[PDB]
DNA sequence: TTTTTTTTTTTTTTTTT
């Protein structure tokens, strides 16, 4: 009277591939409904979802989720298109550069950040970005004893508020090349964390590593060498974003077809 | 078994819009004592009632009960043109933005915030629209603790006492421009806010932000660019106030018949 | 297997008004001992009052069982008559200022507050008032930030000894003329004080504030003009009272009976 | 099911002459294996004896049940008589006190005072009441926070050592003079303690009063109003006391016997 | 069955000589095997040995393993009594002495202080003391946080190092007097203790009080008067003692046999 | 069926080594859906999982592990290999130094500390050897409380990053030596170390001591003499990985064919 | 139902000579997996191994566990025969100092001390003695708060480090000195220690007695004349100690078959 | 046919400190 109900739980689960609980609100809550009235018993069901969130991590990896099951069609049919096209970005390179980057094969290139205002067509592709992938770990500054935490074992690590700071700079250099290192979550817990591509939202400085109550300058190099920088200037309009999930497919799928050639160096040559 | 029994409660939940013990009391109280009965355990009816307050929030908007399916087709028939008539504002005006700050047009223009004292009127207004609503919350800035705690999926957001907070005034200018924020709520519990539309109600000036035992000012440029604010100089009469439904809906459908253009400013006119 | 019993309870509950386990247990003995035999958590019983108590409240008031159909028959059978002669106070005048109070209607005026002798034979009263009345909350001075907390949900309450602190003044203020607020209660929690008529026994002065460690006069005059002074000079004998249900009843239906003007006035002159 | 087995209990505590816990081990101890047995729950067994309680103590005073249906017949017959000989007590007089006290007839008049040693013999009699009555307040001031702790809802209390303090002097002058108020308890609680008559043995002066830091002694015409304070001289010989229960039943049923007119006033006439 | 088993274990647990857990597996070890093979939750056994406990308790005394089953009468026949000879004092006084001491019937005076090296016999001659009877306390002064540990109603209260501390002197000594007393034992628990004789082994002066983190003689003239003092001066020679139960038996059969007058005063006074 | 299934679950981990949750996750993947289907209890799995990994971790130790099956093929043209022959370092006597390190052969030469730059190669190699081993203990030094972390019991101790404390220095020397010490854990429990290889990686001073909250290098002669120190500054090339278990068996299986005499001493010398 | 299971499990505690649950996964793990499969609850075997230690601790001592069941006949030829040349004593004399204190036939005199620099051929012997008999106590000065506690109802105590507090200096004078004392140790515990032989590993001052806040030598003859004391200064080499069982038990074979002449005195002449 | 409760494992604290 258990066994069959928690096969077909984890059979519908991955099937649906479900990541939080609103998700699984709006989806299908009648299975929902139907465990809690058979057993209230949820350790079943959350030993269920992390595995098969393990399961899509470890194997479903994040290019795994951008080439497009479908055509790409067109590349205008996007809102990235018009907004870099007001901003100023070469479409190929910078689709290039975003492949390179979420490969890892780069080497210890593995960070992109941005400077600019937020208006300009920023927080829209943050979220749109954080939203795609079905894990990614957004990372806040909310608890200065540990900063790094939601961020192992993810797709996108998201940095929307602050800078990187100081306490575990060997972690972020870590991660900046795609590497690891044993790194402290909540009370008592050092974890490894895998190569996990990371962006930037904050409007911000990423080379200005937050120390104690100041910025320290000592390993601007490694950062520059192993993060590339996009400046922003000219501001968007109103209401230029709305990136839905198919556009943000085509996108990959046309970056992926099409690859041209991509440097290693911090002075990025923009010139595509 | 208890499936179709979960899905039938989960249904009912749905469709009677419960928010708590009294609402499922005064509704349908048969079930609830048949749910007693058969079983003290209360967590499967706590989490019906919280899943179908989630899809409510996640799902349900404004038009849903806001806007009546059938208009008043008249002026001379309902308290709200009397005690607007009597104030001195611009109907279309008031209903256009009324209209773009509940129903959403814009993005970062969200909020609006209607001052007067306890015999103008605008008091019983307000409560009433807080009783139409259901699913809304009274984020009262009295405690200095956890002041947002009635905002996290909800219909309206009426702020009838205190004002702003300069700990938390991030996440207070996310929701006025109608965005997801992370708030310090609990000690294991900080999720987004959905965007839900903020009534100011306190006399006090909630653009004054409240720092500790302080009032702030530099604080005060986004508070009223991302909002409208209005004034109540005339009174009303003996008891005049406790709009019901039918009024609130023959108004928004009245609204909807005859809205002008909106316009993006804090200060209100001397016109109307 | 409970249904029926659970059921059986909240009629019983609701039918004869008991809001606390030791009126049940001094009322009905058979099913309050066979619901202990039966099931050993007193969750059942628990939901059952509070839906009582709910439904005697939020729905219902007070008159409406305190108005007792069967008239006096005369002009006065008890002593209430002799006592208020004897303290010097308007009879018709108090009569309305008594109605209004029961009522609440007549503008925000709904609150009374005594000055006098310790003992001037409203003790007595006070208690047999509040025993009558199956909601009534005992303001009590236990708590020094937060001494409101007897309020929510209520019929009458009811003011001890000790003057009124700083802490929690506008609350005390909204429910002088109906109006509402929401503060803080214990530790993480804050709550709307549901409005709901108030009577003060202390012959202190209610009128200052205990700020902190001093004695403000600033919250003196909306007090004044949001409720009654009756000052108590003449007091009674030995426990002059023993105010029983069908005297309350009486006095009600005589009163209801003839109904004159009111004069709203801070200032109960006795004279005239 | 277990509705003949609660009644059962119930009828055993209330006719059996079981109060508390050794009360109950040492009347029936069969019974208790016989209820471990029958089921491994204390709730049930708790729940009755909390009921027993309630009503021996609340509804049913004390003398109903301690006061012989058969005279004393000479007074010369137990201890009682040479102690007051030895003390100096007026025979129908201190017997018309000790019924008014008893009774509460006096509306006020309802406290008893001694004022001597320990070694007179006013510790052998109040080891002699304790044991008489099943139930008994032990009200000890060891902790400023607690002053009342053991006398809530009782028909006779016992001031061990210790002096009041001016913290919460109504409730001990409500109790004392045959009323009732809200007394903080444990827990930051508020409990009620209905007029219960007190009996103090220890040598101290009772009257002081501790005030804050300091000890006054304002409370003197509400105490002498409502009191009588008894002085003891004379002592008594070695191992003199030991009173059972049918002497204090005889000499309770000779003082009902005889009733004359008792007095008003704190220093009770020490004649006859 | 369950009320036939629970009679039959507590027969047995009685019969057998049991106390609780040590001694009723040391007597018996089948009884453990047989309640396995019919159950498996060790309540049911701890209730039982809990029970028979408390029977022990109330029931019998200190009497009750004092006087042998055989008479022997002769002084040669244990080692006690030629240690006490060789130590300097009267048998005849000091058998009287120990059978006024064990049936308590002087009251005041229950308490006897002893100072002395070990190897004139204290230690051991305290444990083989406090190992004669089933049910003894042990309230050793060895944490200021717990004053009196094990000592709820037992037959031998043995006092080992440590002093009493200036807080709950008032308990000791009404322990000692003959009488009941309340002291707090663990963070959630506490209950009386009953006139249980107490001896004390300790190496120095246990007269002193130990207040706070100081030595202060307050309550010494109490523990004079109502202890007497043994010095041990002397000392035997090696490998000697062994008090078991036939030696303590003799000991009071002779002192029961030989009785005489005791005196009372600080010092030994041997004088009979 | 519980015993049949809990066996298999027992022969299943010892087969494939399991020692977490997501390793017999990502290996046997159609044993836990096959558990799923057939009931529903991880319970029962995670004792079991427990249960083997204790068996490993006290019956298996690192040679069973680090032997081979096959000839090393390579001697030179692995990374490994090349890596070791540009850094100048002594093949053989390398091997032999592993060998006696790992296989507990030389008892108090049981240490290593690895000194230099990370981009020397040695901080790959050491986490490649940990995630190659199936347990293996992750002694870091985050926290000022917990000194050690899941090294009770395992294949190899990797110390990443941190220096050696001061309130546990005997643990520690026990760990790195091969000595012994009851260490005490948390306030609950407590247990020993298991006789472990352990390789240091941290490139700061290990020597320096944390004691209290200053640096101390007196507990250095214990490392000195226990512990081989290796300078690791030659640098590698950029991200020189590639590390399987057949490369490492290999290795291991040519250093235990080619092992002679190897000269204990702190301080490298040129014997290479 | 559960008694077939106590006995086997008794019945292989009693053969194999489990003291826990490693010794018993040693010695027989498949019975293990079967109760843990057949019974999640652990009462039972938790009674079978307190069962089990009581029978081993309570029921013998130190000679129990001196002549082997195996005879060998050996003496001069293991790593004692080295270690006695090494250190500079009478083999005989040793090995009847050793025989006389495991049998305590001296008195006072029951404890052993070698003093030396470190690794001086004592920690191994020590090590060797502790694993040799299954029960014994740890003694660990890691805690100096708590010293003596776990060691209650042993056969060995074994002291690796530390040094000798005087907040426990009774209960080692009892067990140094054959006798029985009973001691707090943690909070609300007391434990008696029985006359247990002791064996120390470390070698710092033992003398120096730390009381309060610094060290004193007040016990110098009472640690002194109390057990015999030696000198060692020669060390031994690496990987050249580890006794085994086979060599403790020829050892005590050896002596208790050739006894001499012992000296009752602390200073023992250098060489027996 | 016939039930329908074996303990359904009815669900559990606050603590573990």
Same mark, same amino acid.
Not at 67 to 77: A, L, N, T
Not at 148 to 155: G, I, L, P, Q, Y
């Given at each position: 009277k258990t066994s069959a109900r928690y096969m077909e739980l984890v059979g519908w689960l991955v099937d649906?591939? *479900?990541?939080?609980?609103k998700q699984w609100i709006q989806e299908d809550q009648a299975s929902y409904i139907s465990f809690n009235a058979a057993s209230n018993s949820r350790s079943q069901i959350k030993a269920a979802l992390d595995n098969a969130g393990k399961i899509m991590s470890l194997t479903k990896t994040a290019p795994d989720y951008l080439?497009?099951?479908? !055509?790409?069609?067109? *590349?205008?049919?996007?809102?990235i298109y018009k907004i870099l096209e007001l901003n100023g970005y070469d479409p190929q390179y910078a689709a290039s550069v975003f492949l390179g980057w979420a490969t890892?094969?780069?080497?210890?290139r593995n960070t992109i950040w941005l400077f600019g !205002?937020?208006?300009?067509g920023k927080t829209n592709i943050a979220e749109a970005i954080a939203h795609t992938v079905p894990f990614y770990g957004c990372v806040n500054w909310t608890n200065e004893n540990f900063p790094?935490?939601?961020?192992?074992?993810?797709?996108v690590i998201w940095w929307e508020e602050g800078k990187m700071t100081a306490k575990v700079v060997e972690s972020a250099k870590a991660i900046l090349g795609g590497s690891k290192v044993r790194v402290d979550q909540k009370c008592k817990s050092s974890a490894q964390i895998d190569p996990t591509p990371v962006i930037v939202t904050s409007?911000?400085?990423?080379?200005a590593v937050i120390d104690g109550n100041s910025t320290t300058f000592e390993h601007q190099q490694p950062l520059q060498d192993r993060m590339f920088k996009f400046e922003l200037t000219r501001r968007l309009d109103h209401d230029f974003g709305k990136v839905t999930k198919q556009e943000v497919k085509d996108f990959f799928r046309w970056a992926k077809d099409h690859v041209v050639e991509v440097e290693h160096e911090f002075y990025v040559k923009k010139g595509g």
């Open positions: 649906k591939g *479900i990541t939080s609980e080439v497009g099951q479908q !055509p790409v069609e067109d *590349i205008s049919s996007n809102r890892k094969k780069f080497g210890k !205002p937020a208006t300009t790094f935490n939601d961020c192992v074992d993810k797709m409007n911000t400085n990423m080379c």
